Amino acid sequence: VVMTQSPSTLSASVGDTITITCRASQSIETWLAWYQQKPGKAPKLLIYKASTLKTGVPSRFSGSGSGTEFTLTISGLQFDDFATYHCQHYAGYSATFGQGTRVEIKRTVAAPSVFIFPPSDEQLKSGTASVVCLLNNFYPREAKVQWKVDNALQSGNSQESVTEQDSKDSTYSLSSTLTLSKADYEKHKVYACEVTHQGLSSPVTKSFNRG
């Protein structure tokens, strides 16, 4: 049994009415639950048996469907409702989830401002080089960051984190850190960060030469 949510990201505004669809690869009758999850918190049960609202859950949430097609509807989206929603087929001794639908605040596409920072000499003295790439205030959330060291595409030596949707302008920001030993860092010259995003006509590359 495979559960598929639609869409993967749902953009909307406060006061809207929105619908998330969950499709089961085969009939699951009404053995379906909807959960809400806020970042860093535990999931909360919203709806079970396809349409039974859990006690305490506001009446703007509504579940419907049966068989292979199910819908969660929020009528009068409030700010507290922006979060990820999960559908779940649950059986006696197993369960399967959808991939989750993130409900975010709608706005217009915005390309990021990209900046690159070489490692500080203070940190280089310590034997570690952290190269940082900043993608500032972009929308939507999907972005691709590639590290190239002397044009060699890098993998496995970088980590990134993304901010929550900004309260003022509804954009996201991303930080990517490439970490190398001082030796490895000084074995190369050109350090570059290549950013792909919907709001850009072509990928943007920011680079620097060690020196």
Binding site: S113, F115, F117, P119, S120, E122, Q123, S126, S130, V132, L134, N136, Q159, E160, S161, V162, T163, S173, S175, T177, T179
Partner: protein
Amino acid sequence: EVQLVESGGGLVKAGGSLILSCGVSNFRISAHTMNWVRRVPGGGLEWVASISTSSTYRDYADAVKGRFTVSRDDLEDFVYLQMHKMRVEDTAIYYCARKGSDRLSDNDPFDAWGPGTVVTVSPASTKGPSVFPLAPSGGTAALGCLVKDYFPEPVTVSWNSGALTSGVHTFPAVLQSSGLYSLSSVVTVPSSSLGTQTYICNVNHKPSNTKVDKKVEP
């Protein structure tokens, strides 16, 4: 031959938790009282915990009472040791031992031992961050601070003691392979102010009461 195997040892920071497990080969635990014993760096053995058949009785050494829990899983032949609020003196090699003999009586010695797993508890429950400058387009320049190698979460960052808040992004921390957290905090400013405006990031790590002010110049 009867065999036991521990699993789950490693490096823990003081105040943390770790759970050990013990599997067996060539016998069932159901008829055996199972035990946890540890060898301390001084070289002696300390009885840690005992769990009787059917989990009827669970006994603990005084040094670990209230912090450790022993459990058993007879259907799959596993023993468990939960260790919470760990202290430096919990550092030891931990063995699971069977109480038994050729013929089972009401009081038998420990006739089978696992090879042991090393558990080491470091005294440093917290570690303070190093702060490096992310030093400085058209009108907009970006600068920031790399707050690296701290533990545990969280760290707070402000710019100019709170004066500069617009355009500030403090990113979710990231957990490195060293077991230490790292994050960055950035701000975008007018580039024409890079030679007249001072920029200082104020990093506060309350778990270690560490405050660091770092000036970020080009």
